[PDB]
Amino acid sequence: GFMVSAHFILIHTICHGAWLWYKLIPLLQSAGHNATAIDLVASGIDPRQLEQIGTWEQYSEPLFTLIESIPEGKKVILVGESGGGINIALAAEKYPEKVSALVFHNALMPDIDHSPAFVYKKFSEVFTDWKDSIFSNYTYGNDTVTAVELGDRTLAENIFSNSPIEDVELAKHLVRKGSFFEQDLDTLPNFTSEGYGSIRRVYVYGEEDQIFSRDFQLWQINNYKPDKVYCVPSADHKIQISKVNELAQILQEVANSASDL
């Protein structure tokens, strides 16, 4: 039937890296898509350390650079997982002309009427069960920035809670210190209708996500209604790990829906 090939850019959440997309990339490529995963600053094997940045603008630079390399006339589908929802929204606001669709993968999905931090503050209000994760801080400019190193129990029980046990171990050896730069995020200008608000938004959630609850995710969906909502039975927070074929099926539908001449 009708099938098109698209270019996806896949964006990890804080503490994670391009490596997280290892299962999804070959599935997308097998169907003729171009799928690109990158490390954001101080993520994955990026050689910066977190203390060298304090803002979403700096953090997101690799994504903005990549988008600037897309040829005139061509567009990309941005897929953001968890906190990578904030990165793809920032990108959409900055380069709306380059983005055909946004796909939020159990992801923070900002709106236009409140501060960019609004959904993150709600998450932080509603989930506080951080277990053996370790919170620290560092100075960046005038600010004290809060950072987190994800605990083994957090990974196994909340994040990769229905993933193969070898994926929990992989994450253990790869996750790095991360921040949500809340002071920056909460003082940034609001996203706008003509920027981030102009792009088709698809919201995909995992039925068994043990860190972004069903109520939180439905709250985000109701807060800023997307164009389509997909659900993945039995998927945990890391759909691209726990139910990757189901994820790929959905991304194929998104490409088809995004398609144009």
Q: Which residues are catalytic?
A: 82, 237
Q: Identify whether the C-beta of residue 204 lies closer than 8 Å to the C-beta of residue 232.
A: yes
Decide whether 111 or 167 has the Cβ nearer to a second copy.
167
Stretch that binds a second copy, among 71-79, 94-102, 115-123, 159-167 (CB under 8 A): 159-167
Q: Identify whether the C-beta of residue 158 lies closer than 8 Å to the C-beta of residue 208.
A: no
Instruction: By CB under 5 A, name the one of 43, 60, 82, 217 that touches Cl ion.
Output: 82
Identify the CA nearest to 78 among candidates 96, 98, 103: 103
| Helices and strands (DSSP H and E) totals, the chain | 11, 8
Mask 205-224, x = binds Cl ion (CB under 5 A)? --------------------
Decide whether 165 or 261 has the Cβ nearer to a second copy.
165
Decide whether 107 or 241 has the Cβ nearer to a second copy.
241
CA distance to 51, 55, 103, per residue, from 141 (Å): 10, 11, 33
Identify the bridge partners of residue 79 per DSSP, sorted by sequence position: 10, 103
157 touches a second copy (CB under 8 A) = no
Start-end of H helices in the chain = 24-30, 56-59, 61-68, 84-94, 118-126, 152-154, 165-172, 182-185, 214-223, 239-242, 244-258
Instruction: By CB under 8 A, name the one of 3, 32, 34, 45 that touches a second copy.
Output: 45
260 touches a second copy (CB under 8 A) = no
159 touches Cl ion (CB under 5 A) = yes
87 touches Cl ion (CB under 5 A) = no
159 makes contact, choosing from Cl ion, a second copy, none, with CB < 5 to 8 Å by partner type, with: Cl ion
Identify the CA nearest to 94 among candidates 62, 67, 73, 130: 67
CA distance to 65, 86, 204, 224, per residue, from 93 (Å): 14, 11, 21, 16
Instruction: By CB under 8 A, name the one of 7, 23, 114, 153 that touches a second copy.
Output: 23
Binding site for a second copy (CB under 8 A): 17-19, 21-23, 25-26, 37, 39, 44-45, 47, 49, 165-170, 173-174, 176
Binding site for Cl ion (CB under 5 A): 13, 82, 159
Q: Which residues are annotated as a binding site for Ca(2+)?
A: 238
Q: Which residues are annotated as a binding site?
A: 238
